[PDB]
């Protein structure tokens, strides 16, 4: 019944990524709640939500890096309330570098350990998210029915 989003974006990419998953979780009956990770902190974040999703967009110029806004939760999601949550992941990206949504994995190693509980094979989208739309909304109704 309740759902927490949870996004780190730059340019907006995964920002409109975020929103248009809401809507489909809202239309289904969630009651949802939308946060820029610029705007939250890892104590207790998870705290009363029955699914979180989590998404960043991949940086770096010699190694793999998370958006900047989100690092810091990912630094300390010990703190979360991760342990048996249930969770699902996802991102923007371009297929032309080599680590293709690289920060999508390194989230989703990091839950693993924390004993959570992965719905869903992260979203990994390329290019332009509007023309990847129906593959937003078909993985929002997939999670949908793997809770
Ligand atoms: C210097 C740099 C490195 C990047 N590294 C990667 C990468 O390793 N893997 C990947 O899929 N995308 C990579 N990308 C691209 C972004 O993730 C992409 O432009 C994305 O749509 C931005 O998402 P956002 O608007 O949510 O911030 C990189 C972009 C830049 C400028």
Redesign the pocket.
Request: aromatic share 12%; net charge negative; hydrophobic share 10%.
């Given at each position: 019944a309740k759902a927490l989003i949870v996004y780190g974006?730059?340019?907006?990419?995964?920002?409109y990524t975020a929103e248009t998953i809401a809507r489909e979780l809202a239309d289904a009956g969630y009651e949802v709640d939308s946060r820029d990770a610029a705007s939250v902190e890892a104590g207790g974040l998870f705290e009363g939500f029955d699914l979180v999703l989590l998404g960043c967009?991949?940086?770096?110029?010699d190694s793999?890096e998370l958006?900047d806004d989100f690092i810091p939760l990912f630094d300390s999601l010990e703190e979360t309330g991760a342990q048996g949550r249930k969770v699902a992941c996802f991102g923007?990206?371009?297929?032309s570098?080599?680590?293709?949504?690289?920060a999508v994995d390194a989230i989703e190693e990091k839950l693993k350990n924390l004993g959570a509980e992965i719905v869903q094979d992260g979203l990994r989208i390329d290019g332009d998210p509007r023309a990847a739309r129906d593959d937003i909304v078909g993985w929002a109704h997939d999670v949908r029915g793997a809770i």
């Open positions: 974006s730059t340019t907006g990419n995964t920002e967009s991949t940086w770096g110029d793999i958006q923007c990206g371009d297929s570098h080599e680590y293709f949504c690289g």
